[PDB]
Homo-oligomer: 210 residues x 2
Amino acid sequence: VSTDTVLDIALSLFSELGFSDAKLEAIAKKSGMSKRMIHYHFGDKRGLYICCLEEAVRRLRPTAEEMYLASAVPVEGVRTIVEAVFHRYVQHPEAVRMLQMENLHHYGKVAEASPLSDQSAITLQLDRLLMLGQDAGAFRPGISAQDVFTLIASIAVFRINSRSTTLNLYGIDMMNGDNTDGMRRMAVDTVLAFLTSNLKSADEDSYLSR
Amino acid sequence: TEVSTDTVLDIALSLFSELGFSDAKLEAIAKKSGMSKRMIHYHFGDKRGLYICCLEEAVRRLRPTAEEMYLASAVPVEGVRTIVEAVFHRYVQHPEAVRMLQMENLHHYGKVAEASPLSDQSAITLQLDRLLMLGQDAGAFRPGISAQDVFTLIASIAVFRINSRSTTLNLYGIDMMNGDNTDGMRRMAVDTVLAFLTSNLKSADEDSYLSRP
């Protein structure tokens, strides 16, 4: 068994049962790696749990290869970024539930802790793209790469997270084929309309600040 | 001096949204509420009965009233702005109701997806469908967007601020729940919805983004 194999089995259990119910013996039985050797690479159970959160962030982060586009047109460039990001959320729902587990029960108290990953990658490629479109007169000022990413993540995560309550209240399964395509369309059309809007906005240079 | 059904429902909703169904104990709810564990079983039946009553309460706390839904200025754009800000405000005022519903969406304690609806949300949908219909005929809004599409877009932003606050603060150093960012998330919800409805960009021949068979 490899380090990536144990990390995959552990991520699935933590995203389904939580930190309390997911047992190391159950992970050792499925992974094939002894509980003693799991402690050697990942450390204690909380050490393995934080590795799963770092993996969850990594699984949801698109590569520069997945976001490359020859077409200089900033509109089609942003479309590629949105669809690339959204696709990873569709392919990794276990990574989404993994991060949502931490956001509900703060098992790792991650908010006041060391960053899980260096996300200066997808932000830099998007900031440059928004900068080119703004000077070309294609996009309006006041929107940062972090604002665009938050808008994409909000839609991509809501599909997986609020699936059960939406299906109960409105009879809509956001995770079926048709609705997974519709949520992608909503993410693309919402972002592009937001960037190319002629409506009057606040004198603020960003929606989210740090 | 006597505890009420609404009082026990409030204490129970807070524990379930923080600790979950497993850790939140009836003895802890009885100690805070003042109502005996025996009398809590009399009104709510069992612990799962009390849990489902908390989910039903969580939905009505995030449902804006008809008074908040009434648009004063008869403008399609300003009318939608009032709906977006009214919905977003209830999410800001009731983060415990948001975590309550997210508890069910993660661990399906009440298997709510294949169960009786928690609340009749058809009244809020019928009013927004009328406002989008008036704006579409007035040439203000584009076709292909339903009230359910608009509500999903508002909820996505309003919920993300709460349910993804800790990871965002760790990865990007941004507290979406602080004053400045709570205003920015509201601005994003308003500007995003209005831009989406008034977009001149080419869209699919589909009459809705989300569908229901």
